[PDB]
Design an enzyme around this catalytic site. Structure first.
Site, short mmCIF file in Angstrom:
data_model
loop_
_atom_site.label_atom_id
_atom_site.label_comp_id
_atom_site.label_asym_id
_atom_site.label_seq_id
_atom_site.Cartn_x
_atom_site.Cartn_y
_atom_site.Cartn_z
N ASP A 134 31.53 64.37 45.94
CA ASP A 134 31.34 62.96 46.13
C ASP A 134 31.05 61.79 47.67
O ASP A 134 32.79 61.77 46.94
CB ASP A 134 30.78 62.50 44.46
N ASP B 183 24.20 58.11 47.79
CA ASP B 183 25.64 58.58 46.75
C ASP B 183 24.81 59.89 46.08
O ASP B 183 23.67 59.43 45.34
CB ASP B 183 25.18 57.46 45.85
N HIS C 128 22.68 55.05 38.62
CA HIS C 128 22.83 53.60 38.15
C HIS C 128 21.97 52.66 39.29
O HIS C 128 21.43 53.95 40.38
CB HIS C 128 24.37 53.58 37.89
N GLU D 268 22.58 60.92 38.70
CA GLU D 268 23.46 61.83 38.90
C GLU D 268 23.64 62.44 37.67
O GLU D 268 22.98 61.47 36.84
CB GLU D 268 25.06 61.41 39.10
N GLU E 49 23.99 65.11 42.27
CA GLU E 49 23.90 63.67 42.65
C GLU E 49 22.79 63.53 43.43
O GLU E 49 23.20 63.77 44.86
CB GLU E 49 24.91 62.96 43.01
C1 LIG Z 1 32.14 56.01 36.61
C2 LIG Z 1 31.76 54.19 37.07
C3 LIG Z 1 33.46 53.86 36.43
O1 LIG Z 1 31.45 54.05 38.50
C4 LIG Z 1 31.22 52.60 39.19
C5 LIG Z 1 31.00 52.04 37.49
C6 LIG Z 1 30.59 50.15 38.38
N1 LIG Z 1 30.90 49.01 37.77
C7 LIG Z 1 30.79 47.96 37.93
C8 LIG Z 1 31.26 46.60 37.29
N2 LIG Z 1 30.14 46.86 35.99
C9 LIG Z 1 29.48 48.08 34.99
C10 LIG Z 1 29.70 49.63 36.59
C11 LIG Z 1 30.70 50.11 39.81
C12 LIG Z 1 30.76 51.20 40.61
C13 LIG Z 1 31.29 53.06 39.87
C14 LIG Z 1 31.37 53.83 41.52
C15 LIG Z 1 29.93 55.06 41.31
C16 LIG Z 1 29.35 55.30 41.06
N3 LIG Z 1 28.66 54.52 39.70
O2 LIG Z 1 28.72 56.31 41.28
N4 LIG Z 1 31.19 55.40 42.39
C17 LIG Z 1 32.11 54.32 43.66
C18 LIG Z 1 32.40 55.33 44.01
C19 LIG Z 1 33.82 54.64 44.60
F1 LIG Z 1 34.59 54.33 45.43
C20 LIG Z 1 33.56 53.09 43.66
CL1 LIG Z 1 35.59 52.05 44.03
C21 LIG Z 1 34.04 52.91 42.34
C22 LIG Z 1 32.12 53.70 42.79
MN LIG Z 2 26.71 57.66 41.38
MN LIG Z 3 28.13 59.06 43.54
#
Ligand SMILES: CC(C)Oc1cc(N2CCNCC2)ccc1-c1c(C(N)=O)[nH]c2cc(F)c(Cl)cc12
Ligand SMILES: [Mn+2]
Ligand SMILES: [Mn+2]
Length: 365
Positions: free
Chosen positions: A142, A153, A222, A251, A346
């Site tokens: 990923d 993404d 998301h 995803e 994804e």
């Molecule tokens: C699965 C959850 C824990 O992922 C996230 C949740 C939030 N949250 C912000 C606060 N509110 C809830 C959601 C923000 C971002 C990510 C995330 C994703 C993504 N979702 O694809 N991919 C990432 C790559 C990264 F390197 C980092 Cl550090 C973070 C992300």
């Molecule tokens: Mn994602």
């Molecule tokens: Mn991703």
């Protein structure tokens, strides 16, 4: 100009006029009475609204073309025996070259995930990690690219043992289903319900044991915003609607375990809280680290390896201070039960006024 083997020519050099290949264009799905949203494709109002944002779609397309070419290169060499560090560094080197890395204007949106087996997401090796990819590993690659904060993404699953073939097919089918069901005014929960139905219709047999594939219910699709990987809207697996001009990461994750992930292993991923404004810091190492993060990453994600490569050292206490203050958030690896297997697919989709564009679609997935 033509692309070399291994890829080294930046995407903007292959397209001098700055017009990048479109992803897969889909007509929006029909509504409940079967009344189509096909009118959007031919609407003069929708076409003008779509062209007003051509520069934006174009930045996603450049970022998606870098993603397609980077991942095609990765698939040709990724093999058991390689360390997780070697894999991430070799992928990221190509990614930086194809995106033509330029501070916060073009670059890597987030660290290369390469989560193994029961671990579904947010594992990338830290310095000194001796993990070697194995023949029986189920690896989720990923990685993200961006142009002016227009993020791609996009992820796939790597395997060498055919015993996981039907698990990958289930997840790929569930992701493709979510992508097909996605549309302007479609309720987020209806996309999630469609994903779950397809995912759970698959039963798999891995090493003499059978499982009905479970979607990971706390890992969701998301919305994506500018310099914001997760813009706050989620595609849940079970009121909120997808809106015109929105961008989504569709995803899905299939598992042979509990179908719930928990925080496990050491943290490698970090990202500044998008909503945190300027915070004055006097602590010298903490101040210096936050300045490094602001200059190099801003609101985009990073990992410890990306701090090491900038020549930073003795930053762990400084990084813990930023996390304790709520300025940076840690994103630890998310793992299902020991002995379980997880797969992921994804794509990034643009809800353009005229059509749905699976901008990161390739001939691969
Ligand atoms: C699965 C959850 C824990 O992922 C996230 C949740 C939030 N949250 C912000 C606060 N509110 C809830 C959601 C923000 C971002 C990510 C995330 C994703 C993504 N979702 O694809 N991919 C990432 C790559 C990264 F390197 C980092 Cl550090 C973070 C992300
Ligand atoms: Mn994602
Ligand atoms: Mn991703």
């Amino acid at each position: 100009k033509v692309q070399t083997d291994p890829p080294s020519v930046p995407i903007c050099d292959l397209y001098p006029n700055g017009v990048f290949p479109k992803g897969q264009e889909c007509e929006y799905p029909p509504t409940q009475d079967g009344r189509t949203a096909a009118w959007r494709t031919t609407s003069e109002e929708k076409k003008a609204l779509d062209q007003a944002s051509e520069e934006i779609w174009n930045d996603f397309r450049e970022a998606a073309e870098a993603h397609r070419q980077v991942r095609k290169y990765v698939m040709s060499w990724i093999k058991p025996g390689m360390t997780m560090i070697e894999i991430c560094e070799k992928l990221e080197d190509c990614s930086r070259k194809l995106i033509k890395e330029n501070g916060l204007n073009a670059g890597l949106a987030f660290p290369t995930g390469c989560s193994l087996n029961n671990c579904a997401a947010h594992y990338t090796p830290n310095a000194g990690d001796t993990t070697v990819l194995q023949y029986d590993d189920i690896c989720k690659i990923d990685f993200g690219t961006h142009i002016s904060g227009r993020i791609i993404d996009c992820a796939f699953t790597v395997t060498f043992n055919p015993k996981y073939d039907t698990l990958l097919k289930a997840v790929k089918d569930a992701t493709n289903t979510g992508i097909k069901c996605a549309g302007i005014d479609v309720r987020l929960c209806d996309v999630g319900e469609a994903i779950q139905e397809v995912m759970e219709s698959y039963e798999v047999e891995i090493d003499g044991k059978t499982y009905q594939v479970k979607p990971i219910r706390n890992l969701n699709g998301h919305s994506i915003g500018q310099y914001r990987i997760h813009a706050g809207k989620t595609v849940p697996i079970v009121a909120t609607r997808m809106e015109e001009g929105e961008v989504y990461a569709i995803e899905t994750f299939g598992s042979t375990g509990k179908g719930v992930v928990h925080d496990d292993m050491e943290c490698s991923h970090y990202m500044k809280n998008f909503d945190v404004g300027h915070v004055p810091i006097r602590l010298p190492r903490t101040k210096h680290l936050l300045n490094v993060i602001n200059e190099n990453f801003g609101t985009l994600a990073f990992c410890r390896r990306w701090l090491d490569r900038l020549g930073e050292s003795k930053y762990l206490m400084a990084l813990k201070n930023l996390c304790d203050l709520g300025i940076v958030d840690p994103y630890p690896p998310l793992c299902d039960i020991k002995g379980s297997y997880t797969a992921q697919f994804e794509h990034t989709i643009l809800l353009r006024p005229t059509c749905k564009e699976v901008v990161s679609r390739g001939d691969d997935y």
